Design a binder for this molecule. Structure first.
Ligand code: BDP
Length: 466
């Protein structure tokens, strides 16, 4: 029989605001070698982005951002017209790649079709300062100041000391040396160039020092998060993914500290379920939908201003898989992001769970949407326990629920949201939407084990609204 838990919504306890550009994706800079991928002609991928959000952020970086070289004088045919660059697997140096001017032109078209903004990585790892300044000039001219959110100078510089990009003695001070040189060169050529950093892999000790040292130079602070890895490790499983861990706790403490101590916004600019390119039977499963949806809300509740889920090609953890030649499809993780998309922007509200020690992995977030309607996103990440949730503090004549479901937590397919799969080019409409009648602010919702739900509550006395 279900675990009976209480959910107390407190509309008077206002939390952080979820901005319209909260959602986002991350891709390898190596993708810029193929101008057909981020292109106005890539209507399928653009549709998947628009379904994820009217607004949102595309971040380009990753390990390959150290191995990609802008060449303003490249033959256009230097482009690899067939490349679908999956997440870097981090085992060794990536292939070097050239970025052509047409790739940047096509990226602008893609941003225009999607309505998304851009975070753009620059090659501080293996590139020169002059070439970074040239690259930044072209991107600023082509993408424009309205859509260019930030440049980032190097990806995960806290790992340079061990992956061969720098000597083993590389540390924060040395990175701050590197960063200052690149910054200055770029600003000389592009006086309005926006920046973010440090784009760190894990090392939260770099965050406040970076923010303090470069406070007047950056728009926001960024760091990364991967829940699990390596993939070959038998301890890295679906159940573990449903649980908090010390890394997440430190990253969360980390973002709170930098926001409190500096007043700069934080963005989680690269995240996914398992590093080294993800884990088959974990990252590509319905479990990842619950993981990602919940992470979006948990991060927002802690103060994050956005997220970028890493992906590309047919990578085990990619939200969207495919190529311009064969077409694109939503993987399971996409459906967690879709639940968030459907919930929309607004302001988080107090929502406390009780009597939940036998269902400890259930999470719930309450939101007053921009339109004034209360929503509740719930993730029953308990793999073995169904729950019955007694919801109080929501006064509405009624709510509807859209379910996030698959027949088993490890399914690589059969994933639906609101009773429907996502179709071609991001097409999605709910086909199953159940009612919940309520009284005195009280509602009772059952959820199967390993499932999600989005509740949307009706306005009071709004039946005859225009
Ligand atoms: O290992 C991974 O999956 C990812 O690790 C991150 O640290 C890198 O920035 C990215 O390029 C990789 O794809």
């Amino acid at each position: 029989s279900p675990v009976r838990v209480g959910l107390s919504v407190d509309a008077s306890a206002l939390g952080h605001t979820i901005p319209p550009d909260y959602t986002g994706l991350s891709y390898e800079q190596a993708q810029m070698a193929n101008p057909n991928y981020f292109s106005g002609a890539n209507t399928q991928l653009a549709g998947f982005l628009r379904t994820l959000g009217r607004q949102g952020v595309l971040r380009i970086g990753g390990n390959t951002s150290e191995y990609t070289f802008w060449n303003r004088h490249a033959k256009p045919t230097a482009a690899d017209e067939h490349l679908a660059a999956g997440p870097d697997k981090g085992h060794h140096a990536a292939a070097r790649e050239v970025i052509t001017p047409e790739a940047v032109n096509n990226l602008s078209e893609f941003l225009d079709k999607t309505g998304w903004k851009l975070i753009y990585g620059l090659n501080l790892g293996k590139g020169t300062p002059e070439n970074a300044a040239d690259e930044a000039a072209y991107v600023m001219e082509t993408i424009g100041a309205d859509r260019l959110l930030a440049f980032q100078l190097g990806n995960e510089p806290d790992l340079f000391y061990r992956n061969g990009i720098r000597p083993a003695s590389y540390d924060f001070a040395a990175y701050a040396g590197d960063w200052q040189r690149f910054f200055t060169a770029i600003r000389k050529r592009v006086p309005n160039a926006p920046f973010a950093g440090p784009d760190t892999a894990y090392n939260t000790k770099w965050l406040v020092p970076f923010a303090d040292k470069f406070k007047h130079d950056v728009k926001f602070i960024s760091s990364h998060y991967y829940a699990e890895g390596p993939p070959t490790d038998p301890s890295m499983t679906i159940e573990r993914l449903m649980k908090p861990n010390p890394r997440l706790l430190g990253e969360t403490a980390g973002l709170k500290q930098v926001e409190a101590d500096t007043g700069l916004p934080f963005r989680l600019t690269e995240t996914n379920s398992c590093y080294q390119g993800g884990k088959q039977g974990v990252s590509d499963t319905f479990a990842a939908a619950l993981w990602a949806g919940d992470l979006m809300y948990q991060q927002a509740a802690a103060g994050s201003t956005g997220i970028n889920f890493h992906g590309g090609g047919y990578g085990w953890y990619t939200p969207v898989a495919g190529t311009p030649e064969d077409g694109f499809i939503a993987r399971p993780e996409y459906y967690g992001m879709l639940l968030f998309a459907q919930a929309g922007a607004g302001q988080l509200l107090g929502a406390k769970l009780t009597d939940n020690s036998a269902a400890p992995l259930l999470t719930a977030y309450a939101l007053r949407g921009t339109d004034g309607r209360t929503r509740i996103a719930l993730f029953n990440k308990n793999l073995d326990a169904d729950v019955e949730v007694a919801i109080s503090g929501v006064a509405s004549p009624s709510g509807t629920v859209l379910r996030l479901e698959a027949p088993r937590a490890d399914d690589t397919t059969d994933v639906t949201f609101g009773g429907a799969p996502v179709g071609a080019s991001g097409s999605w409409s709910p086909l199953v939407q159940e009612y919940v009648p309520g009284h005195s602010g009280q509602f009772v919702l059952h959820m199967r084990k390993a499932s999600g739900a989005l509740l949307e509550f009706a306005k009071l006395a709004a039946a005859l609204q225009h």
